[PDB]
Amino acid sequence: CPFGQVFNASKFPSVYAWERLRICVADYSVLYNSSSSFSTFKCYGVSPTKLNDSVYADYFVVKGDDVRQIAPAQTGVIADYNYKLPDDFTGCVLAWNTNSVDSKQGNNFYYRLFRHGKIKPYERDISNVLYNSAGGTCSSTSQLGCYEPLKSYGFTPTVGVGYQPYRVVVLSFE
């Protein structure tokens, strides 16, 4: 199966609009033979020495500091509104630093900050309407209480390691 189209992909999606491909021979030569490549690598419910003996891959760009939210039983802007995993989760989360690729002039990634309620596990909300802080809907951001739910990451070539884009791939083993 084309792991090269996920890990070696030319572009990743925004965290608010993550993409999912379904996974053939279960190779691991790109996961456990080169671990100096990944900055973060944590597994849940399974060990690196057990996986070898449907797996769908969810991938997206998130800033370094928010990488910690990509885990079971987490809270936060990403965990609650963009990408949620169930407490009973089995699989691995891998991430690496791609500042040299994604932090350019015309590369704009977005995350959701405001929503009328939290998202369910594996739910993907890609709508874009004005958020009314008092409840319901509104128009014109000039009016107090009206905000845009999607905000960009201010990614630039020279910014801190905690504000640098990371490419995250989540392998869920069902």
Next chain:
Amino acid sequence: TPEDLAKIFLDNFNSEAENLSHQSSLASWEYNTNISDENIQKMDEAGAKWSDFYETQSKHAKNFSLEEIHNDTVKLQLQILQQSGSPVLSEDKSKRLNSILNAMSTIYSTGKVCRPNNPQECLLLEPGLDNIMGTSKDYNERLWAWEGWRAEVGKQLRPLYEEYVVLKNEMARGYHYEDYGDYWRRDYETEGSPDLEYSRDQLTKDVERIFAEIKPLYEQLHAYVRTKLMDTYPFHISPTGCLPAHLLGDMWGRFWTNLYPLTVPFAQKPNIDVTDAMLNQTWDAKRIFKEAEKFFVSIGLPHMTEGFWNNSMLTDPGDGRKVVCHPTAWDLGKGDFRIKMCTKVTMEDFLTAHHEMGHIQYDMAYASQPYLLRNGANEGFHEAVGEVMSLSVATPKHLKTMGLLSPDFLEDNETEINFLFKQALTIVGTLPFTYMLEKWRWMVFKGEIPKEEWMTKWWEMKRKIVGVVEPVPHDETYCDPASLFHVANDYSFIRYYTRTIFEFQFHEALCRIAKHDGPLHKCDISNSTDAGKKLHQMLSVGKSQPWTSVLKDFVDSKDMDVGPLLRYFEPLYTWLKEQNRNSFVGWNTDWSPYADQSIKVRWNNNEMYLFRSSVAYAMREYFLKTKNQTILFGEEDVWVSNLKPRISFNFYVTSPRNLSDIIPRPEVEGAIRMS
């Protein structure tokens, strides 16, 4: 409900601001590193977008009630937005005020003084006059530069400053402050428990208290300088009186640093200078910052990040672009920290590197705070933290372990005072200047001093507080407290007073945790992680807590305290005291350089004009008829002193356009009697 809505508002502001202020700051960096016509307009464009956003959000922030918020880190952020970003002025008054400030800045920055033998030769302040006041020993040249500046730039800023004060007060009242002076010192105000509260109108009481405690030491420094300075400028300085303003080694008299070479305790003892050691050992500009880092690291502070080392302009790049060589530490936002310097292999720029890295450690410390709270607890803390670090590395003990000061070098108690004296001229000699400058401005904005009394009160209180007297009298067409950078460009000057007081409170606290045993002026907090981590705790708080409580947890007190300053300089004090045994200590505010030879006379500005013209007339005829000399005296050549409107005044006359040459009293009296 209303608190949650306020929180949503702030969450929107902070997430939207963080990646917007970044662009404006980044554009500013690029401009100062590469000065171009294209870069300046990009800087303004990025700045404009940020400013517009802030204004809109500040206006929105006004319709949330503070009484409905039960959270301190929320209520505080609302207060910050509500009281700034949106002046309450008519469009005509918004176009105007921004047209006076720009005018004043320009007039100051392009100001020049020409010569009374030659017009096409004019000196500018920065490359010119400043390097005369700090070097020359010629009474007459010093007077020219001093007076010329005030008589050239000062006369242009007077009518602008008057309009400025009126408009700024109206603006301040739009934020519900009594006046602009009151607005300025709002930064020191705190809310909280009855024990930890502080009122903005308390600052005007506390700085006075500290000053009164400082004065007894200043008087000893003053008397010493006066008796030593008298041997360089004989017949110009009285043993019982004030020092002439132009003889202080500075254009404004802000620092007495440049008097050191004239007033040095032990001229036969050298000062420590490792510029030669740095060059001999083959130091470069980079090594200086690596050593600065090592110092901070040794006390448990974080290492400098890679972004700093790769992006900062630490050394002038050579050529191909013009840079602004004015040392400053930058926080670009979002983990992007930099230092902008044109570093040279010298001792003075060694201490500077430590000072600017002191800033960047602080900026990192509170990076975790909400955008609006990413600042110091107080405006005086940010420079106290930076400066306290330069005291610990100026100590010979540090240079000896570093290998910059020669091995087996001998130091004694003769040279410790030689050293403290030099510092006193910078730290103590500047405090009464800062104090009375800000005090005067406060009274002007408040409205205690009428426009017609601006210059009379300025020099009246300056002679009383500082002990400095003008070489020539000034009427109300002048504006001396406008020919200085901070006054012309609308900056607060109190932050240069309180940071000196805090600096030594921090110094003593640190030298105590580090278990120093000995004199306070010879302590060293290097390798002391117990003092370092205690400091870090005080820095990381940012502005999320009132400075009174932030200070208490670090220094074990609340109000600012000069005690530590007086103790630091105690040695020196007890030495000056035994030197000033045959001299007079203190001064009398009734002596002036021009009061010896003047005529007492016993009624608006138009009547005074006629009087002065009449005097010039009598002079012209007296000289022509008596000595057969043709001298063209004008109205501008007759100076008026001690004006007590309608009743009396003093006057004297100088040779045409010659400031230094005063006509002998018996000769001018003759002209008056003759006609």
